[PDB]
Design an enzyme around this catalytic site. Structure first.
Site, PDB file in Angstrom:
ATOM      1  N   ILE B  43       0.866  -1.170   0.000  1.00  0.00           N
ATOM      2  CA  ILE B  43       0.000   0.000   0.000  1.00  0.00           C
ATOM      3  C   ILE B  43       0.906   1.222   0.000  1.00  0.00           C
ATOM      4  O   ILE B  43       1.930   1.239   0.680  1.00  0.00           O
ATOM      5  CB  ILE B  43      -0.943   0.000   1.217  1.00  0.00           C
ATOM      6  N   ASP B  75       5.448   4.404   3.474  1.00  0.00           N
ATOM      7  CA  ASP B  75       6.720   4.141   4.132  1.00  0.00           C
ATOM      8  C   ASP B  75       6.620   4.617   5.587  1.00  0.00           C
ATOM      9  O   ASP B  75       7.596   5.048   6.217  1.00  0.00           O
ATOM     10  CB  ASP B  75       7.881   4.836   3.387  1.00  0.00           C
ATOM     11  N   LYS B 357      28.061  -5.125 -32.783  1.00  0.00           N
ATOM     12  CA  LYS B 357      29.336  -5.240 -33.497  1.00  0.00           C
ATOM     13  C   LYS B 357      30.251  -4.053 -33.264  1.00  0.00           C
ATOM     14  O   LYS B 357      29.908  -2.929 -33.600  1.00  0.00           O
ATOM     15  CB  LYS B 357      29.096  -5.381 -35.002  1.00  0.00           C
ATOM     16  N   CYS B 433      31.896  -0.647 -41.043  1.00  0.00           N
ATOM     17  CA  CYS B 433      30.424  -0.746 -41.006  1.00  0.00           C
ATOM     18  C   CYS B 433      29.879  -1.516 -42.203  1.00  0.00           C
ATOM     19  O   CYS B 433      28.659  -1.634 -42.381  1.00  0.00           O
ATOM     20  CB  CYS B 433      29.778   0.644 -40.991  1.00  0.00           C
TER      21      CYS B 433
HETATM   22 MG   LIG Z   1      10.011   6.514   0.248  1.00  0.00          MG
END
Ligand SMILES: [Mg+2]
Ligand SMILES: Cc1ncc(C[n+]2csc(CCOP(=O)(O)O)c2C)c(N)n1
Ligand SMILES: Cc1ncc(C[n+]2csc(CCOP(=O)(O)O)c2C)c(N)n1
Ligand SMILES: Cc1ncc(C[n+]2csc(CCOP(=O)(O)O)c2C)c(N)n1
Ligand SMILES: [Mg+2]
Ligand SMILES: [Mg+2]
Lengths: 511, 507, 507
Positions: B43, B75, B357, B433
């Protein structure tokens, strides 16, 4: 580590990082405040990184504990636990109190932001050890809080619920829009109805933190907070329990006649003229200005007074300016709220938070309303108004009840009043047998002339007598509503041109 | 209550309230998601009242616990302890981990937003029981709040520090259009660790049909084959035989491949000639709108240079258009300087290449650093980008890191590391190339049943072979160039690779 | 009070009040500069109350008269007569010159803003005692209110008219990054006239440190060496010997110079081939951010065409970048039409070139105009733009107009005119941007001790010789081109110049 009873809520400082004057630090400010009071500190970060938060919080808990004052955190419970905080302050939309207590356990202080009495009811159904102190509502408009829905009137309603519920364990501080221009008023009219509880302390933010000189700003708030006299009017406020004597009434009138009070009337157009005539009769000059800029020059003039209606066309923004302008020079304001209807209710309560009044005049309805509700009833209601708004209240009817709730201008922290409750403030009656805003004008003039050594009570009473006296004299000499009004102004003139109060009909008893 | 080793990181859903389609609920989305995977839930409320947070997190904890999947909180630790959550995820600018561990005690799962190797170093200096899993960097651009290469550098630090206790999840911009690629190249260099899980948000929450989006990601997550190109990717360790080289050239000649060249002005002309020589048609379009239609033509192939003038936004476009039709891209980063470093590292995160390459210098740069050394770097590049990596010089080294197109969660590679992938060499004695274009054509003509690796090697022979021939028939730099194109034409027109000068050994 | 002849136009400061850094005064700066050069002051108030103006022109006439330095007012005559000023500067849109000379009368200094030759004609038919000095046009873009070529045209008229009484200062965008170039190529076509001094400001007044800014500007002005290319700039009148041409070629094969080409599409390919043949590496970058990085690489060289699709803002970036590190630039304007004429003259004011290459047409226009004719123009171009210049035809003409990078105030050259610089010729009988690439490589290779001139010639010889050789061994346009590249390869792989067909005679 302190203990709940050690917390000195005298001058509670709350911080805000983004508001610091350029060239200064949050630490510098919060320091200069600990050297001059700021006896409690809350750290407030509504926006910073929850890390920088912890860093700044630790940094200030050293400075704090150093000066032996606790640190509180708002409103992150985790951060509080994390750094060894002494207490946390939480709001009504933050984690529930019960959940916090379970995580932190007893012994840590808990603030709760309370604005309504209904929230004191819940605080109480939780019992001690739950909430320890509340911060009361938002008393005045502030630019600090950026988001719900006060005045002293609203804070009284809360202190009263702290008593009905006997929440003895719970202290209070007032917060929001608190500055030196209204601290005494707030401290002074924020007491519980029973006179037992008042605010234990004052909260500031933008007053120190935002200050270009926090050292001085803090020393000033100290000055006011532990002073005990709010001399709001330049008159005597002594409590007189002796009835007003004939000699007293006579000397009130000689003064008001000899000092030609200037009475500014802010009122409706129907009293404009009439009210001016009562003033002219009482030997004083009336001015009818509703001009904001003038207001400060007007109130500068010797022995000036402000009489004040509601329903006046003037914008509230000018009333707030006028009211303040008179309080700044410490002159008398006579308030008279004619209301009742939803709009006027709002307007009247907004006005009552603009300053301190020397007198609040009303009739039965307007008084029972202001008290937040017979004859024994009016008396009790006049006293409640008187006490509530720390003012001399007049209630007009067949009888006239005056009550003195000024209490000599005393406030104190938490005490709160000296056991002086609603029930026992002086209240006197005046009558003269069966028989408006003209009284307000009269009351206004008597208070207006009084000198330094006068008394505000005896003035407001002399006025009610003078008027009820002219009242009786007119009702006998008149032919109907028309001539009664012009003989009233006549009687008021003759009566005060000959100071023989030993003659006038009104009888002055105790209520 | 779960235990650390009960956490299934497969499809890890992080929630966002203000992103849900009108008429739908955060409960609604997060429910349909659990029914089809969403084997873990975080969440996330960076804005809401810390009470409505608690309210809404209790209501989702009943839902999750009922389908038997944990609930993590980001958090606010307080909210986590408060509502008895299973884990908490914190970012770099949040509460220090030692402090969190001290308040929740061991047994709670902690997440740490890590995007740089230096932070894996602090995560190890703390030992187990501290950080339990990490979210790797921001893989791709997202509008809700590096690349796969930036993640590998982390999965590598997790190995050098032997932090066995730490799981990993990838996050940021992950959708059906790049999930399989993330998973496929997000492996440690020693092949022993990969991402334990894929983490989404805007892809389920903001879905008008949450139910259906979840069932698609599950689809990709527990499959194990990234058939990224319509060619066989088998791991051949038997050197390319002369009959194989022959068949390759027959197929490229019979399907007349169309090779898109997005290159500089100098190669423009010369590259198209080499293509023409090989019996195929070049297109030098650098137009975005054309890109989808082009790559839909039969046997289409994209050859790609850096320092081309076309904008990144269109290169992103092209690479994508070709990986969508499962055709082969050949990458050639010429560079070296600050601008070209930044530009190439951005291009390498736009999609999957069939062959990168370079020459010696280019190869060491890519490998993030002699003859034994070239060999190591060429493997490193090949494994790092899961591609066939060529390195030019006197010797040309070809390394195969496609590993049959296999990925898996946490495994990661079947122990198959950088050191033990097939690497061969080609040489024809002392003598750009254009090689790009040759390789390009060879891979182009390969049929569903062909082989990528063999084809890339065929190209390097043919080129190296036309090389010796030219150097013998020329009067200088000028005529060498036309004759190299001629010999390419004469060589492929007679399939007798048993005739060619270049010797092909093991490395 | 001074006299017309006591006027030292060396470092000429021009105030601006609203541009002083916060914390400083116009008094503070104008003082700060007086102590480090600032040998003549003008007062400029295009906006203030003509009272405050007056107060400030007095306050500042003390500070100036004290360091023995005059004071000039612009462009209010009244205020100059009013505060007893030493001279007035007026522009073209201001009070006609006659009227002024009547109100202030001789003995006072009158400076005029001139930016076209025509205005010098007017200024001639008025005679001496009228205009004393003149600020020349606006030289480079500025924010406070033509190029060094526009300036030249004016310094020519001042000579064709013989206005010996008239000094000159340069003004407009003069800063440390371009003062020496201005001082250097700003001479008369007859070599007898040059700038008597340099006008700031926004370089001293705007300066966060006015003392340092003024010391620097001094350094540049009275120095006499513009080392603009880290290569020999010595005048050589000895025809370039075979030994030198041979040394030239070894240095460039051995140093493998990096030649950055900025050119159209058609010279891209062909251009890189020639450079290759000469054993050096071609870069085709038109990328703005890379440009400083490229020029830091050793032995780097910039070949510049017009009609490149690169934005002008970038060519400015590049031209400055190579000048900052003192590496050679070869300019090849292919034009001719209104738009191209513009773009070219514009590049020729971005920085200092080491060689300009053109054909009959191109060389004629650059001179601002047969076989005697093509020699006089080649000399004009070489001298005008201070560089080695190359006119290509049946005969090729080379002219060293660098004069050892010598500059000095007003003098201005050492009697070295357009008519008498070393100019040599090169022919090989009856038989483009290639010659650009060739020259760019021969100059690129040169070390600190080498010689620009000899190298330019070396290239022309090489390219000429490779011409005769190709013309013989070819069957047409096509085979000619390839054969030419081959012959460049062969010829340089065996430095035997004594062998070559091209004949090197004086012009
Ligand atoms: Mg955070
Ligand atoms: C002890 C306590 N009580 C209430 C609150 C919430 N609160 C009500 S108003 C306001 C701003 C006052 O600043 P100012 O003095 O500038 O009006 C604050 C922060 C709190 N955070 N802490
Ligand atoms: C487990 C974990 N790892 C990292 C972070 C930080 N973070 C990195 S990207 C971003 C947006 C993803 O949605 P989208 O799919 O739109 O990229 C989030 C939230 C976190 N909160 N939780
Ligand atoms: C002697 C003389 N010549 C010309 C003028 C007119 N004018 C041309 S450019 C410019 C500003 C350049 O400063 P910078 O480019 O350094 O910011 C001014 C003041 C004058 N007033 N006096
Ligand atoms: Mg709160
Ligand atoms: Mg002018």
């Amino acid at each position: 580590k302190f203990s709940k009873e050690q917390f000195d809520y005298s001058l509670y400082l709350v911080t805000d990082s983004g508001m610091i004057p350029e060239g200064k630090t949050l630490y510098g400010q919060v320091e200069a405040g600990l050297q001059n009071g700021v006896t409690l500190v809350q750290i407030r970060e509504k926006d910073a990184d929850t890390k920088f938060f912890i860093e700044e919080a630790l940094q200030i808990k050293e400075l704090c504990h150093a000066h032996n004052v606790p640190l509180i955190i708002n409103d992150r419970i985790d951060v509080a636990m994390a750094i060894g905080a002494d207490g946390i302050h939480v709001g009504q939309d933050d984690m529930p109190i019960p959940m916090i207590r379970k995580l932190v356990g007893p012994d840590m202080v808990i603030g709760w932001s309370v604005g309504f009495p209904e929230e004191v009811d819940e605080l109480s159904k939780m019992g001690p050890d739950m909430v320890d102190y509340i911060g009361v509502g938002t008393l005045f408009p502030t630019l600090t809080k950026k988001n719900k829905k006060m005045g002293t009137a609203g804070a009284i309603r809360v202190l009263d619920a702290l008593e009905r519920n006997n929440a003895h364990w719970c202290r209070t501080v007032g917060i929001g829009g608190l500055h030196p221009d209204n601290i005494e008023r707030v401290l002074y009219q924020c007491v519980s109805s029973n006179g037992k509880r008042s605010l234990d302390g004052i909260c500031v933010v933008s007053d120190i933190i935002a200050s270009l000189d926090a050292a001085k700003s803090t020393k000033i708030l100290r000055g006011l907070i532990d002073k005990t006299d709010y001399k709001f009017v330049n008159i005597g406020l002594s409590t007189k329990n002796s009835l007003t004597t004939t000699d007293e009434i006579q000397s009130i009138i000689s003064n008001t006649l000899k000092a030609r009070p200037l009475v500014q009337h802010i009122t409706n157009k129907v009293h404009q003229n009439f009210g001016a005539n009562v003033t002219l009769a009482l030997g004083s000059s009336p001015i009818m200005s509703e001009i904001q800029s003038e207001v400060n020059d007007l109130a500068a003039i010797p022995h000036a007074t402000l009489l004040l209606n509601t329903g006046s066309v003037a914008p509230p923004e000018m009333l707030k300016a006028a009211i303040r302008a008179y309080n700044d020079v410490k002159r008398p304001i006579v308030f008279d709220p004619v209301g009742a209807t939803e709009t006027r209710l709002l307007l009247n309560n907004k006005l009552l938070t603009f300053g301190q009044f020397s007198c609040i005049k009303g009739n039965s309805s307007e008084i029972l309303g202001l008290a937040e509700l017979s004859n024994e009833l009016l008396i009790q209601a006049t006293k409640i108004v008187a006490f509530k708004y720390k003012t001399v209240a007049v209630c007009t009817g067949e009888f006239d009840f005056i009550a003195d709730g000024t209490i000599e201008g005393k406030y104190s922290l938490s005490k709160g009043t000296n056991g002086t409750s609603v029930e026992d403030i002086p209240c006197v009656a005046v009558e003269a047998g069966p028989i408006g805003c003209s009284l307000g004008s009269t009351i206004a003039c008597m208070i207006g002339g009084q000198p330094s050594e006068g008394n505000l009570f005896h003035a407001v009473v002399a006025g009610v007598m003078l008027y009820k006296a002219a009242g009786k004299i007119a009702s006998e000499k008149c032919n109907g509503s028309g001539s009664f009004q012009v003989e009233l102004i006549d009687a008021l003139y003759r009566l005060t041109r000959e100071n023989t109060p030993v003659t006038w009909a009104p009888k002055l008893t105790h209520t």
